Every structure is written in C-alpha cells, then in structure tokens.
C-alpha cells in the first residue's frame, strides 16, 4: 500500500518529530476527548481527564504504529492486524471517531509543528492514514 512521495512527506514530518512523537500522540487524544460529546456515555475506560497515565500511555501507541508502519509500510497489514482484531473483533468500538483522531493530530501538533506548510504534507498524515485505516479494518479477502 502507498509508495509515491506520500511517504517522503511522512518520514519528513517524522524527522522533525523524532523523540517527540509519543508526545504529540497523547495530545491528539485530549484533542477530541476534551469535547467528550458522545464517547462521554461510552466511557473509554481510561480516564480521558489528566492525572491518567493511561491517556499518555495510549498516545505512544498511535505514534508507535506510524513508526512501526514506516518501519515496513510494505507489510504492516500483518503487524497491525491485531489492532483491527481489537477494534473489530472486540470493544465493537465505532470507527466513526477515526475522523476525529485523524484531524486531532493536525490540531494538536499545531501547538508545535502540524503540516509544515508544504502543499502535500497536510495530505501526508491525512492520507497516509489510508494505509493505517485500511489495516485497522482490513476486510480480510
């Protein structure tokens, strides 16, 4: 999946991030949770409020996937196959949030370095999710 420069923009953004990826990943959660409109009744089970090392422990899971994904991006559908089993074969979560956590990274990294102002980067983390969103819900042929 993916192959064109779409990655060069991702590896680039991942270059400035560096040892700061697991950090922006946590701020992406409090981004949509702060409004806690629907999930409020869902109760994710990890105190979306501060004083919850569980919230910051989840961000590292998102920034760790993009890395483990950039680590292959040519065979990640098998390594990230578990996530699809935990969100599809468990928790029955509603991917409808994918649209939130997707823009969150852009609104959360803004406080530091979001797109970068490149007529393509904005689409890199937004479209590169196409390979991360497809492996998160692989239809399994």
């Amino acid at each position: 999946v993916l192959s064109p420069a779409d990655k060069t923009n991702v590896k680039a953004a991942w270059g400035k991030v560096g040892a700061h990826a697991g950090e922006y990943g946590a701020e992406a959660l409090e981004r949509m949770f702060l409004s806690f409109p629907t999930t409020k009744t869902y109760f994710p089970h990890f105190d979306l409020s501060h004083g919850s090392a569980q919230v910051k422990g989840h961000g590292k899971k998102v920034a760790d996937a993009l890395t483990n994904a950039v680590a292959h991006v040519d065979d990640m559908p098998n390594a990230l196959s578990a996530l699809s089993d935990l969100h599809a074969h468990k928790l029955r979560v509603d991917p409808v949030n994918f649209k939130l956590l997707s823009h969150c990274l852009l609104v959360t990294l803004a406080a530091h370095l979001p797109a970068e102002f490149t007529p393509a980067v904005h689409a890199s983390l937004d479209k590169f999710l196409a390979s991360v969103s497809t492996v998160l819900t692989s239809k399994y042929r």
Partner: protein, 146 residues
C-alpha cells in the same frame, strides 16, 4: 449553535486574532491538499495545474474573504443562521450543489489554521466551543438540500 457569552466571547474574539484579510484564502488552498478530489466544483478557478497554482490564484485570495466572511456573519447574528444562510444554501444547493459530505471538513481544516498560527490559544474550552458553533453552517448549507 448555542454557547454562553463567556465561552462564545473567546471563539468569537479569536476573529481579531485571525487575519481574515487572507487567512480565509489559505483555508481553502489547504482543503484542496487534504482533499483535492473536489476538482469538480473548483473547476472554475481554472488555474490549478499544480497545488502552488492555487495559492498563486488571485480569486482564492478574494474568495477566501467570502467563505470566512459568511462565517463571521453568523457570530455577528447567531439569532438565526438559516435566515442569512438562506441564499448560500440555496445558491450552494441548486447553483453549486456541493455534496453535504464536505463542510464537516472545512470545519476541521480552519481550526487547524488557528491552532497553528495561534496554538497558544487552542485552550480546551476554546475548541469544544468551536465545533457546535460552525456545525450549524454545515447543516445550514444542507437544510435546503433535503
């Protein structure tokens, strides 16, 4: 839309912090990058050979004040959105017929332009009180569709 003068005065006061004089043109030039497939309606801008041709277009600059302008009109009169959005919706419904699955995006893009140029103000209470506000426009331009 429906917020208290306190939480609304913030998302509403950010208007000054926002240089609508052009920030409205960069909001669209970006919506294309994150979603360039909408090349069916922007077919009028003509100039679109490359993403850079969009920011170089003169209309996008003046057209940005129109898009971000219609929004400021609401904050200037939230007494009734469908009242003023009656033309935009009718003009965007029968004249442009923009699919209803797009506004929800222009709302997540602009916010990113603020958290970036003004991340020192993306306080939690300023964001939550930013969706339900413009969320009315997304439907306003769709209330005439159905």
């Amino acid at each position: 839309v429906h917020l208290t003068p306190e939480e609304k005065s913030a998302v509403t006061a950010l208007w000054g912090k926002v240089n609508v004089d052009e920030v409205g043109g960069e909001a669209l030039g970006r919506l294309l990058v994150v979603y360039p497939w909408t090349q069916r309606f922007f077919e009028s801008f003509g100039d679109l050979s490359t993403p850079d041709a969009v920011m170089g277009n003169p209309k996008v600059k003046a057209h940005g004040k129109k898009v971000l302008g219609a929004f400021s009109d609401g904050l200037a009169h939230l007494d009734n959105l469908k009242g003023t959005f009656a033309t935009l919706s009718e003009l965007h419904c029968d004249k442009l017929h923009v699919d209803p699955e797009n506004f929800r995006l222009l709302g997540n893009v602009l916010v990113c332009v603020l958290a970036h140029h003004f991340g020192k103000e993306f306080t939690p209470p300023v964001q939550a009180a930013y969706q339900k506000v413009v969320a009315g426009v997304a439907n306003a331009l769709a209330h005439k569709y159905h």
